[PDB]
Amino acid sequence: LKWHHHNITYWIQNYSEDLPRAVIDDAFARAFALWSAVTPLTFTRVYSRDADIVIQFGVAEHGDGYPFDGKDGLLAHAFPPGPGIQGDAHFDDDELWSLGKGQGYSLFLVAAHQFGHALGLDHSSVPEALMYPMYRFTEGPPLHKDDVNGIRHLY
């Protein structure tokens, strides 16, 4: 299951109260940049519901039939490629979002993982691969050779 076009679009519907708009826009862009670096895909920011990947921050019940569970636990979730809600990525705003070393969760790293799913990737079994199902902070290049092979296999 994957996208049939390579010029993918995204829409940042809203923001979190934890960080400045500029920091959030940048974090999402750098996250998309990791993937386009190893594939023929490109990512374009738009401002309408016509975008392939719609990004949203929410708490508890927020629309779909999948409410978040308050602080900690599930950090976020996304859907596989397709029309409508498919391909979208949502982030639990009951979590403390930040960047780098320190308390709170890295928005940059979590976004990179969520976008992996929105592109068609599944969970990895390599505990050190980005697509590994459990959160873990890391410095340096985020994508493990397992992630790179997985995306290249699809696109």
Ligand X SMILES: CNC(=O)[C@@H](NC(=O)[C@H](CC(C)C)CN(O)C=O)C(C)(C)C
| Token pair 């990895």 in the structure block, residue | 124
| Interface residue list for its own copies (CB under 8 A) | 18-20, 22-23, 26-27, 30, 96, 98-104, 106, 108, 139-140
Give the alpha-carbon dihedral of 22, 25, 30, 31, to 10 degrees.
140
Residue type, 92: D
Q: Residue with CB nearest Ca ion?
A: 102
Minimum gap (Å) between residue 12 Cβ and Ca ion: 13
Under the binding rule (CB under 5 A), the answer on residue 147 touching Ca ion is: no
Sheet containing 7-12: give its strands across.
Answer: 42-45, 7-12, 53-58, 89-92, 76-78
**Which residue stretch of 4-12, 38-46, 72-80, 144-152 sits at the interface with Ca ion (rule: CB under 5 A)?**
72-80
The interface with Ca ion within residues 99-138 (CB under 5 A) comprises 99-100, 102
**Which residue stretch of 6-14, 16-24, 131-139, 145-153 sits at the interface with ligand X (rule: CB under 6 A)?**
131-139
Q: Which of 74, 85, 96, 126 binds ligand X (CB under 6 A)?
A: 74
How far apart are alpha carbons 83 and 86 in whole angstroms?
5
How far apart are alpha carbons 82 and 73 in whole angstroms?
27
Minimum gap (Å) between residue 65 Cβ and Zn ion: 8
For ligand X, the closer of residues 51 and 130 by Cβ is 130
Contact 12, 24 (CB under 8 A): yes
